[PDB]
Amino acid sequence: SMAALALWAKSGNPFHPLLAHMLDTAAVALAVLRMEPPRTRALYAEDWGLPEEGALAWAAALVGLHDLGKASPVFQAWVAHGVFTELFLRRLLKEKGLPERAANDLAAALGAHHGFPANAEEKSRARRHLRTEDPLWKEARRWLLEEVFRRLGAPLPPARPEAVLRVMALASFADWVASDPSLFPYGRDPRRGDYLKEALRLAQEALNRLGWPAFAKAQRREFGELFPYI
Ligand code: NI
């Protein structure tokens, strides 16, 4: 069962499913995109040719998939998981309908090297693992991508370098917030219907905390969007 394999994959702790972390990360992404200035949100709308609401759901879903590379026997019970994320997303985002070049660029944005694409050796090593993994893993990773897109209500756009870099920076921030168990406690069950609502509440509380005077001291401006500088 691919669904069982997908749900069994872990992130960061045995009681924290990968899917839970992916949805947490998406929730952070969506919550912070809602708080960004109108100029920032308008850029996303223009990046993807979507009404603002759809553009933001799409970006949030993409950012949630930053750890899809962990859905591999290599990271469950050397090459960084982001290299796998890039290889997997290159294929999977094309299967979802994104044109080749946009898919390749986004995959690198969500990969191991803060938007710079994995080199030949890294991709050789990774493919070496992929050749010997149980085939069900390939199916489990398609399942997970579809699960996140469906939970976020993300549409496919009908890609400029700045659009891709905006997603890169967002994923880096959101992954960091969601990765903190003091903000996003382990043990929440992502099968539950109410999971995303609860993750959005946690996202809102976390972003509030991160902004307090003893944490945030200035702002980071990257590619037309803004993050607290911690
Ligand atoms: Ni992560």
In words, what does this structure look like?
The chain is mainly α and 230 residues long. The protein has a two-stranded antiparallel ribbon. It has 10 helices and 2 strands. The protein is globular, with a radius of gyration of 17 Å. It is 60% helix and 4% strand. α2 packs parallel to α8, α4 packs across α9 and α5 runs antiparallel to α6. The protein has one domain: Orthogonal Bundle (Hypothetical protein af1432), CATH 1.10.3210.30. It has helices at 2-8, 18-35, 38-48, 52-64, 81-95, 100-109, 120-132, 136-152, 161-178, 195-211; strands at residues 218-222, 225-229. The structure holds nickel (II) ion. The PDB classes it as hydrolase. Keywords: CRISPR, HD domain, nuclease, hydrolase. It forms a monomeric assembly.
